[PDB]
Design an enzyme around this catalytic site. Structure first.
Site, PDB file in Angstrom:
ATOM      1  N   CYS A  22       0.871  -1.191   0.033  1.00 35.39           N
ATOM      2  CA  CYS A  22      -0.034   0.033   0.019  1.00 35.39           C
ATOM      3  C   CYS A  22       0.845   1.340   0.138  1.00 35.39           C
ATOM      4  O   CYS A  22       0.268   2.353  -0.457  1.00 35.39           O
ATOM      5  CB  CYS A  22      -0.962   0.021   1.205  1.00 35.39           C
TER       6      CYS A  22
ATOM      7  N   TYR B 103     -16.516  11.458   2.576  1.00 30.71           N
ATOM      8  CA  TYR B 103     -17.561  11.623   1.456  1.00 30.71           C
ATOM      9  C   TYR B 103     -17.952  13.171   1.319  1.00 30.71           C
ATOM     10  O   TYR B 103     -17.964  13.630   0.231  1.00 30.71           O
ATOM     11  CB  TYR B 103     -18.617  10.835   1.512  1.00 30.71           C
TER      12      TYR B 103
ATOM     13  N   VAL C 183     -22.506   6.499  -2.636  1.00 31.15           N
ATOM     14  CA  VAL C 183     -22.950   6.398  -1.299  1.00 31.15           C
ATOM     15  C   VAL C 183     -24.469   6.699  -0.811  1.00 31.15           C
ATOM     16  O   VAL C 183     -24.994   7.198  -1.810  1.00 31.15           O
ATOM     17  CB  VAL C 183     -21.945   7.221  -0.286  1.00 31.15           C
TER      18      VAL C 183
ATOM     19  N   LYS D 200     -28.072   4.611   4.501  1.00 33.96           N
ATOM     20  CA  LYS D 200     -27.762   3.020   4.728  1.00 33.96           C
ATOM     21  C   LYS D 200     -26.711   2.812   5.535  1.00 33.96           C
ATOM     22  O   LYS D 200     -26.302   1.576   6.028  1.00 33.96           O
ATOM     23  CB  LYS D 200     -27.500   2.543   3.205  1.00 33.96           C
TER      24      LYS D 200
ATOM     25  N   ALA E 144     -18.689   0.493   3.915  1.00 32.83           N
ATOM     26  CA  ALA E 144     -18.916   2.046   3.766  1.00 32.83           C
ATOM     27  C   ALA E 144     -17.757   2.670   4.329  1.00 32.83           C
ATOM     28  O   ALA E 144     -17.221   3.921   3.929  1.00 32.83           O
ATOM     29  CB  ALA E 144     -20.178   2.369   4.617  1.00 32.83           C
TER      30      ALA E 144
ATOM     31  N   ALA F 252     -14.657   1.642   5.109  1.00 35.64           N
ATOM     32  CA  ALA F 252     -13.053   1.213   4.517  1.00 35.64           C
ATOM     33  C   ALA F 252     -13.010   1.673   3.117  1.00 35.64           C
ATOM     34  O   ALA F 252     -14.070   2.212   2.454  1.00 35.64           O
ATOM     35  CB  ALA F 252     -13.200  -0.403   4.723  1.00 35.64           C
ATOM     36  N   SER F 253     -11.821   1.566   2.653  1.00 40.49           N
ATOM     37  CA  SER F 253     -11.547   2.069   1.412  1.00 40.49           C
ATOM     38  C   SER F 253     -12.128   0.682   0.533  1.00 40.49           C
ATOM     39  O   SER F 253     -12.338  -0.334   0.863  1.00 40.49           O
ATOM     40  CB  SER F 253     -10.067   2.134   1.353  1.00 40.49           C
TER      41      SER F 253
ATOM     42  N   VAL G  73     -11.239   6.546   1.604  1.00 42.95           N
ATOM     43  CA  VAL G  73     -12.509   5.536   2.215  1.00 42.95           C
ATOM     44  C   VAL G  73     -13.600   6.275   1.144  1.00 42.95           C
ATOM     45  O   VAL G  73     -14.519   5.547   0.791  1.00 42.95           O
ATOM     46  CB  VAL G  73     -12.731   6.058   3.687  1.00 42.95           C
TER      47      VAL G  73
ATOM     48  N   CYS H 198       0.000   3.545   5.662  1.00 38.09           N
ATOM     49  CA  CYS H 198       0.239   2.170   6.222  1.00 38.09           C
ATOM     50  C   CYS H 198       0.486   1.115   4.892  1.00 38.09           C
ATOM     51  O   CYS H 198      -0.152   1.486   3.905  1.00 38.09           O
ATOM     52  CB  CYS H 198      -0.817   1.729   7.405  1.00 38.09           C
TER      53      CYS H 198
HETATM   54  K   LIG Z   1     -16.260   3.355   1.333  1.00 36.10           K
END
Ligand SMILES: [K+]
Ligand SMILES: [Cl-]
Ligand SMILES: [Cl-]
Ligand SMILES: [Cl-]
Ligand SMILES: [Cl-]
Ligand SMILES: [K+]
Ligand SMILES: [K+]
Ligand SMILES: [K+]
Lengths: 391, 391, 392, 393
Positions: free
Chosen positions: D92, D185, D225, D229, D247, D249-250, D347, D379
């Site tokens: 990563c 977002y 998104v 939800k 949602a 997490a990446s 994300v 990371c």
């Molecule tokens: K996401």
């Protein structure tokens, strides 16, 4: 018109090869051709007389179009010979003979070849058509998926057999004793030359290497009696009884019989080996397949009006030692008359072939006038059986 | 015993779905269950009366153990019902009916179910067992390898058709006009409601989705007549004649018939639809399969002393437009009496099902007293044929 | 002009090189890496905790799992605090790893590093595209062929690219075959003379229920028949070919690792350095012309340091193909008796991510005090790396 | 004694939009996206292509991309055949590690001008079958995204499952994670609508024969998104007491970023205005399961090295591998949340893994005001992290 009488004029087979062993370079259809050509030669009839052919074959995937046609034309039979491939799982080789006998009885043909073939060495893996699922997928082994897993219980035939071991109280030690007996009978029979009219040799030819002549069954030498009671019960961890040694193995082979009406044998000056007297199919719960051959045999006896004592030799296919023991117990027959020269546990089980092999074996081994009864269980809960009399 | 007369009591089928289309979510065995259940219901008999079952099914890889047994148990028939799966390639569905008829004729059973099933949408890819070769691994399509490739010539069935087009002088424009006529007649028959008794609807159920009811054949609407003469000749790029429009397509479907002896029909007081008069298999040089149905049809006519003029309706399976034209040319029969309500070029060709479908269609379409003749070519150079008379 | 830390090699160790599907085929590339790394730290005579960071060349990483170098390092028993990077410059990877490590050391960003290369060609997988299976089937491709050996731009094998240089420089089959036999002869003589005593460490292969196998020498160099060499067919070009299985490198398994540190760190740790890393360079040409890229890279290094070719005691020009070595000899006009003197990749084999590190490691051991050694290595895509070291 | 090194500056930082998995850019291989970003960056920098001496690109899932991925990207961008190339894999962290290693070469005076960045096409990552004999009973075809990209070797579980371990240890609950996710977002949408990526992102034309051209001009993932939800989604990485969701997490994505790097001297010679100076960088590693805390240490190393305080940093870019990771870093470092991931992150924008380390450094370059310090940290699988400090010029 009345039903015609059906006779077996010849019965021939390849040796049975071990999984990925001596015959593993040959496709099922090629073993098919070898057995069919051998059977015709032994019959002593012109090949043109053979009118139609049925071959049992369970694992047809990747064998190419029309497996029976490939076997027939590969044997040099005329292009005018209609062909059909038969699948009643483990019973396939016997059911082919039964169905051919029906056509003859009706007078729809006068001479047929019927038998079975299987190359478990060459059965492929499959991938589903469609889009690959995120995370990957396991390509299934068709031996496992199509050959050996019960659809309804979602477990191996070997695990199904454990159910019968439990219900009938047939213990691990008894199954192991049966299997050792089969290996012993197989070796003795080979050493006494008892397969000299039954088995024909196979020459395996590879470019740039020497010919290998395969002349006897491969599987029965692959055993060590001292290790038999040491094996793991691979189909059930707790309270198991079935093992690799006391179960049938995966194998390659083919067998073929020439069948005629009595009128056709007379016309062709052929002296037939045996008469086909009667046959039947039975079915029970899928898990209970080991017991179906009891019902199929009982049907044939009752149809013909014979008692079990009237049968000189029994061929009860050795799918597992457990199967034979359940049959002897339920039918209360003399164990000395059962699988006299070995069977599938020690000779191996090319599944589409074995039902034909066991009928062909009776045809050679019975003495004049004697009745032989062959029976064979199949995946899904079925069995076929057949009664013949030696002429 | 004397041979028994066989009658068709019911004949039922699913609609035929397009490749990866309306029925693609259902395995072949499930379509089989649907047809079998429907046929028994139409016959007006208890499921327990059905004694034994044979189903045609060409591409059995990955379907799981004993496909016919899965179809039969899936339709709720008794665990006592023996099952066998039949493979004569494209002729499989008719050969199953022929072989069941022979069992009935021998008095070995009194009521059977016979038919065929195929889900070409679900036929998998294969990988060979063994060591992965350096440089890559090929995954072959079982539809192509087992279904559609001639073993001996190493060409597609469509290229065999091209060979017959050459020899019999059957042109591209002639094959195109035939195909347009098949599409036309299929639509006319559906609009006229001619399948109201033959076809039963299939309900497709997806978790969290609305039910989809499939009530009519999918394929016959998938065509553009203006584009037919413009399509590429895919089996032979130069001076070709066979195209995707004028060839049969890949499809999904099942068909099943209830068959009985005349004595059983009377005992159960059912009204039989047709009697089975005669049937036959022929075979010729593998590349010449398009003409095998000519010989098979000729055999059945000769067997019962009828002339071609005595046949009211012909069903010559439309494997390709070329095949029907070749048959009409050799037999010199009235085209207006052939495939009158369409056929495999426009309705589709689930290969193990089609031979049963066409016999079922005659059973519904013939008028009382009329004779219908059904014939169907198969890979490897074979054909099956059957003559029935409407009651 | 920057003032940089001086970089020295303290140890250089490798596994033996195994044949394709041969003696080391049960071992993943990362495991071979762990073996070489552990061996080099042992030879260096330093605590494992002194290694600050690790770079490993590795060309075919598919299916090896997450972070191959991390797997090799933790597998060697190095601390969980050790940062790791896996390097891919195709065939040059093992050398580029050493170069990039040297660069960190020069900047004073670390004081002790391990750098090398690893490859298990035996364990390289096949691939299937994501998506829907096309009607009629598909061939799953071999990653050795697709990622390792095929030029992207010319859509042909490296061996076929080499035929191109054979034509232009008039390097015929006979000369190539003579070079190959020479390589096999030199590899045998070196092994027999015990020339790899300090460089190679043995590996013990353990299989449950079967006896152990100790692999203590390179497998490939004994797989030859000198009588058959001139009779072999030319696999990459049927019409007027020169390159064959015998005179080209082979597919192989192995790993190599070097302990590198600043001159200062060596003093602190009371270790005697083997050699000094003097200079290094990369060069590139047309993708098809990769056999001649090592000429330019080597010249860059000589010009940079202000040396002449005659100043070099020992040359290691990676034997990707016998053709490559002959092309370099011709263009540079150097003494063939000073080139690949103890064999090379044509006879010892070519685990692609490791060879660049192996050849630097060999110079380290074989050079005499004060002598200069030049190693160069062509790579897929039209590249080369080269490095000058001086024995201490 | 410390070496005397050349000063390194960023002269341009350009990227493609980020495409969703099997989404808008899925027809394009990683190397093509690489070429587009590399050409972008050169054009933006206003220098001839022939000035770039050498290239490093991060790229984690190289299987099936063909030989020498970085060489493909470079030659595809029309750079000289004379340009040496190296493909970098620190999982990563790859896109950032590429910039660091290129910075080290420049510092040594080994090159005067380089391109460094990262590329990933997760849409095109293949499945694998092992070489050898097919074992009785079946053959596995493994997904390389899962096997090489997202599965910790040592623990044998998903990255997201390791993340649950830090959620546990530092008491970071579902609700805080979800709040963070929504925040990401929100920031992404705001930034996009404000025209904040006007000089950062370059548009991509997708051409399919017969079809009308598709011009992808903005990041695809942030519109995918529904906030209502978010609280309802299942915790897919752990049965009991989970916190990580799809949602928060990446996601899996496609994209490439490239930066033109040069010495202070080369920027003068070429008469180009540098954007930022690269001050320091570091790598840290911890227990593989504890990868979310690795960036804390790498960041601390950098600040300690330069003698700066956390309070001195104007803008933080902590890669949003998981919402959890950012919150764990905000917690341990005790920094101002209003200064972290200001214009969104992985994300909401997506995580083409070998690209992201380069993207975030590229973002600071454009977003910082004159004289400000920015710290970027990321990371990586295996328990590592990279960190970089830059200062806007
Ligand atoms: K996401
Ligand atoms: Cl059955
Ligand atoms: Cl046939
Ligand atoms: Cl390069
Ligand atoms: Cl790391
Ligand atoms: K056994
Ligand atoms: K059509
Ligand atoms: K060689």
């Amino acid at each position: 018109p009345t039903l015609k009488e059906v006779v077996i004029v010849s019965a021939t087979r390849t040796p049975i090869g071990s999984f990925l062993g001596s015959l593993s370079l040959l496709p099922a259809t090629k073993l098919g051709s070898i057995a069919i050509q051998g059977a015709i030669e032994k019959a002593g009839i012109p090949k043109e007389e053979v009118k139609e052919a049925y071959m049992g074959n369970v694992l047809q995937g990747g064998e190419g179009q029309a497996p029976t046609r490939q076997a027939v034309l590969g044997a040099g039979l005329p292009i005018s010979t209609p062909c059909t491939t038969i699948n009643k799982v483990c019973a396939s080789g016997m059911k082919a003979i039964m169905m051919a006998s029906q056509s003859l009885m009706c007078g729809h043909q006068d001479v047929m070849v019927a038998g079975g073939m299987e190359s478990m060495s060459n059965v492929p893996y499959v991938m589903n058509r469609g889009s690959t699922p995120y995370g990957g997928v396991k390509l299934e082994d068709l031996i496992v998926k199509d050959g050996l897993t019960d659809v309804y219980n979602k477990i191996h035939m070997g695990s199904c057999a454990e159910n019968t071991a439990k219900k009938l109280n047939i213990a691990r030690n008894e199954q192991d004793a049966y299997a050792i007996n089969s290996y012993t009978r197989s070796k003795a029979a080979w050493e006494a030359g008892k397969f000299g009219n039954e088995v024909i040799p196979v020459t395996v030819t590879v470019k740039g290497q020497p010919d290998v002549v395969v002349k006897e069954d491969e599987e029965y030498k692959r055993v060590d009696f001292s290790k038999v009671p040491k094996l793991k019960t691979v189909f059930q961890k707790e309270n198991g009884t079935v093992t690799a040694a006391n179960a049938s193995t995966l194998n390659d082979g083919a067998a073929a019989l020439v069948l005629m009406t009595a009128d056709a044998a007379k016309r062709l000056n052929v002296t037939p080996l045996a008469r086909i007297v009667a046959f039947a199919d039975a079915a029970v719960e899928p898990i209970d397949f080991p017991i179906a051959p009891v019902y199929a045999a009982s049907m044939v006896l009752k149809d013909v009006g014979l008692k079990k004592e009237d049968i000189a030799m029994w061929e009860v296919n050795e799918a597992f030692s457990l199967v034979v023991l359940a049959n002897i117990k339920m039918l209360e027959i003399d164990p000395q008359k059962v699988n006299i020269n070995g069977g599938a546990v020690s000779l191996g089980h090319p599944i589409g072939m074995s039902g034909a092999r066991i009928v062909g074996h009776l045809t050679h081994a019975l003495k004049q006038g004697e009745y032989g009864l062959a029976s064979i269980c199949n995946g899904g809960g079925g069995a076929s059986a057949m009664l013949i009399q030696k002429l």
